[PDB]
Amino acid sequence: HLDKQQVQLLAEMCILIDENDNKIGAETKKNCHLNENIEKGLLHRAFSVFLFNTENKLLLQQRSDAKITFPGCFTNTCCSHPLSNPAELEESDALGVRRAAQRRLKAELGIPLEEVPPEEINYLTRIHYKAQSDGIWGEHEIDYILLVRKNVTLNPDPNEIKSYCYVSKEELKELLKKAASGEIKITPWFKIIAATFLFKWWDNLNHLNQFVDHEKIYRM
């Protein structure tokens, strides 16, 4: 009964990890997102991209109604998972995750691979969180937060997103208030980052060295 193309993506192989983000196996995206498996501890690696343009506006997307988890929710630029293959399993300088981010930026938003090569993708820190989308589907990940600063071109896949918009800080606040009123919905990872680190980073977009932490995994 769910969207066919999204169903086909449920077969992708995700990277299973222990609570310290050490790789321990691989499992399908479907199984990694079933609350029944999450309830037993199944945890996978993921990433969340926050992309800002020269005007310092953050690029948001509204997930399409076809997404199996949190459909129609407003959220940050891109969120997905590195796959269990040689290229994206690469742990050196989080290269696997940055390659996966480049791949999904192209697949979801239509950003050319060349505009967002790994060297343009800055890995800030990791956050561990768990949530439920519905009675059946949910999330449980150690999420690599990645930041991109560039004036990209876009050509999104409507199967992935039903809308996108660059927002200023004040515009994001009006957005968050509309979410608090149940007017609109936002994803759990965006809610967590927005309530903790987002605005701090946004103020130091030029000096995010003091905001990089590759040692600690923040437990949210």
Residue 93 CB, nearest approach to ligand DMA (Å): 20
In the region spanning residues 51 to 90, those forming contacts with ligand DMA, defined by CB under 6 A, are: 67, 69, 79-81
Check binding of 48 to ligand DMA (CB under 6 A): yes
Shortest CA distance to 19 belongs to which of 49, 42, 47, 48?
42
Nearer of residues 120 and 141 to Mn ion, judged by Cβ? 141
81 belongs to an annotated ligand binding site: no
- Classify the C-alpha dihedral 19-23-28-29 as positive or negative: positive
The entry of ligand DMA, Mn ion, none near residue 48 (CB within 5 to 8 angstroms by kind) is ligand DMA
Q: Which residues touch 53 (CB under 8 Å, ≥6 apart)?
A: 59, 149, 150, 151, 152, 166
The entry of Mn ion, ligand DMA, none near residue 172 (CB within 5 to 8 angstroms by kind) is none
Site string for Mn ion, 118-147 (x = CB under 5 A): ---------------------x-x------
Integer Cα distance of 33 and 215 in angstroms: 26
Q: Which stretch binds ligand DMA (CB under 6 A): 19-27, 91-99, 116-124, 136-144?
A: 136-144
Shortest CA distance to 149 belongs to which of 174, 124, 128?
124
Q: List the catalytic residues.
A: 79, 141
139 belongs to an annotated ligand binding site: yes
Question: In which residue are the tokens 């995994």 written?
Answer: 217
Residue 120 CB, nearest approach to ligand DMA (Å): 20
What single string gives the DSSP state of each residue in 31-83? HHTBHHHHTTT--EEEEEEEEE-TT-PEEEEEE-TT-SSSTT-EESSEEE--B
The entry of ligand DMA, Mn ion, none near residue 79 (CB within 5 to 8 angstroms by kind) is ligand DMA
Calculate the dihedral angle through the C-alpha atoms of 8, 10, 12, 14, rounding to the nearest 10 degrees.
170
The entry of ligand DMA, Mn ion, none near residue 80 (CB within 5 to 8 angstroms by kind) is ligand DMA
> What secondary structure letter does DSSP report for 107?
I
Integer Cα distance of 2 and 118 in angstroms: 33
Residue nearest to ligand DMA (CB): 46
Binding residue numbers for substrate: 29, 63, 67, 80
Binding residue numbers for Mg(2+): 33, 44, 139, 141
